[PDB]
Amino acid sequence: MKVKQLVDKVEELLSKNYHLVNEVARLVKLVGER
Amino acid sequence: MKVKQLVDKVEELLSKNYHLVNEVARLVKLVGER
Amino acid sequence: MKVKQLVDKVEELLSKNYHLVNEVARLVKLVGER
Amino acid sequence: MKVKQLVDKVEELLSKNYHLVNEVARLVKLVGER
């Protein structure tokens, strides 16, 4: 199923973005608190 | 429903991005006043 | 159609996270200088 | 919209996301060598 495969890929994309946004939030916190 | 749950997730990440971009802008302005 | 709407939102998120990460790199360089 | 349009877009997003994840890893390493 082409659409099911695409949605699987979007799900993984969204998990990767959840984690990278957390990483960025940490960097931004560290700069703020120097 | 999977697609709806993924839309909820992207919306949460869009809001988190919004506030981080705003925080970075605040910090750049402050650091530039040093 | 739910999938195309999800894909557009993921595109928006990725574009905004590119901007965020660009600005974080700029901020990190700035705080090292200033 | 055709399924093929969505598949091609999601492939583009996956490649763009790959580089985003790698840029965040690069920044996390740089900050961690504080």
C-beta separation of B6 from D10 below 8 A = no
Experimental method: X-ray
Tell me which chain A residues have a C-beta less than 8 angstroms from the C-beta of B17: 21
What are chain C's partners, defined as 3 or more CB pairs within 8 angstroms? A, B, D
* Contact across the interface for C31 and A34, Cβ inside 8 Å: yes
Yes or no, beta carbons of A17 and C13 under 8 Å apart = yes
One-letter amino acid identity for B34? R
User: What is the Cα–Cα distance from C22 to C5, expressed in whole angstroms?
Assistant: 26
Separation CA C15–CA C9 (nearest Å): 10
Signed CA dihedral, A15, A19, A21, A22: sign only:
positive
- Chain C CB contacts of B3 under 8 Å are 2-3, 6
Residue type, D30: L
Distance of alpha carbon D24 from alpha carbon C5, whole angstroms: 27
Resolution (angstroms) equals 1.4
User: Measured between alpha carbons, how far is residue A5 from residues A1, A9, B6 in Å?
Assistant: 6, 6, 14
| Dist. CA C20–CA A28, nearest whole Å | 10
- Rounded to the nearest 10 degrees, the angle between the axes of helix B2-32 and helix A2-33 is 30
